Ligand binder design. Sequence first.
Ligand SMILES: O=C(NCC1CCN(c2ncccn2)CC1)N1CCCC1
Ligand SMILES: O=C(NCC1CCN(c2ncccn2)CC1)N1CCCC1
Ligand SMILES: O=C(NCC1CCN(c2ncccn2)CC1)N1CCCC1
Ligand SMILES: O=C(NCC1CCN(c2ncccn2)CC1)N1CCCC1
Lengths: 193, 193
Amino acid sequence: GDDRELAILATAENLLEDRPLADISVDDLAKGAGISRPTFYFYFPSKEAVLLTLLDRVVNQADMALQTLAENPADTDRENMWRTGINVFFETFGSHKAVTRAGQAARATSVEVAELWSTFMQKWIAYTAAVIDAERDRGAAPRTLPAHELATALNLMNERTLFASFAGEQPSVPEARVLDTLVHIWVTSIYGE
Amino acid sequence: GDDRELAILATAENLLEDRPLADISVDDLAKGAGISRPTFYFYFPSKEAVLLTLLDRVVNQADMALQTLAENPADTDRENMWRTGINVFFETFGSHKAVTRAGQAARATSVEVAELWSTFMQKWIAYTAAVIDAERDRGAAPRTLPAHELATALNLMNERTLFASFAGEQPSVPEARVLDTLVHIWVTSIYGE
Ligand SMILES: O=C(NCC1CCN(c2ncccn2)CC1)N1CCCC1
Ligand SMILES: O=C(NCC1CCN(c2ncccn2)CC1)N1CCCC1
Ligand SMILES: O=C(NCC1CCN(c2ncccn2)CC1)N1CCCC1
Ligand SMILES: O=C(NCC1CCN(c2ncccn2)CC1)N1CCCC1
């Protein structure tokens, strides 16, 4: 039941390693899932809905992880606390690079994908800003830029820079160096006078 | 001569204010330029080549401006020196937002557009890194991250954050606040211990 649904999702993620969604047909997905074409259409309306489900699954995994961390602070210094959050993305999206690439390709023209991403970004930006504001209130960080603006730019930086790293874009920070690079810019800009 | 070429480019930029390149036909461009379809094909091979030319023109304008600044340093403090460079983008791409939007949409699937962007980003990243290295050598900045990695992340941040601002994306830093936001993150991360 969910078995055929899971098989379809698995096939799509496997195929997305090799080519883009426009070179993948519903028939390829059904065939990889061991089902016929009209059976496919009972679980999904289109190959784009399959991508949307993969993306929704990845983004919810990252969001649940961050929600765990937020409830269970590490006992370590500030620099390590920001690193542990950024590492959620580095690990979760970094474990699903083909899905990430296809999501980015899609939101060029898909309103559902853009909106899904936006909702989550708003949430994590707000959380980031709430932390920065808490740090200023406790006297740990200086009141420099408006926290929400700062949190928007640092979150967008991470989106773009992790994407380029995972893609191996030229230019890009090597994947082995991207987390230390991001952490340095977050700590200096949040705590720096 | 260049007159009909200039008219075609002008028509394409005007139309790109209203819809994407996929809703624009060669016939629309010719008609707006006052020429026939086969006459269009004498100046350009396709509507995509017209976009590529607009993009090449915008990116060369920004690059020539930065080359002017690099040759003619302002007499002001460090913070203002970085602001003057970032402002080149804010002004040049910000004066051509529809072309910028269409360029971003395109590089989702166009190798020529991706490569053109990449070449220039490499150049400005290298320049940024050379400055950071000069600042460390003169004892004005601390030796923290490798300069080239730092310069890659800060340049990618600007690309993504200015794009979102100019687009009015949700989330995005308002256009009136984006330059001060970027400058703060560049100065703290370059000069911050
Ligand atoms: O790296 C990021 N964001 C990092 C932030 C860091 C702070 N934060 C968080 N920290 C501790 C617990 C829960 N949340 C929210 C996530 N992004 C890449 C794709 C878009 C966002
Ligand atoms: O590039 C990004 N984020 C932006 C894209 C947006 C499209 N898309 C997506 N995914 C889930 C839900 C909705 N949209 C894949 C992510 N990252 C690189 C690694 C960290 C996140
Ligand atoms: O805002 C940026 N980059 C800013 C840098 C700042 C330093 N710099 C420069 N400074 C003084 C003179 C010449 N060059 C090179 C450009 N970007 C947005 C799109 C991609 C790059
Ligand atoms: O988003 C960006 N940059 C990236 C895109 C890349 C596609 N594209 C482009 N343009 C010229 C030459 C090649 N590609 C338009 C720019 N910016 C926002 C304002 C500052 C630059």
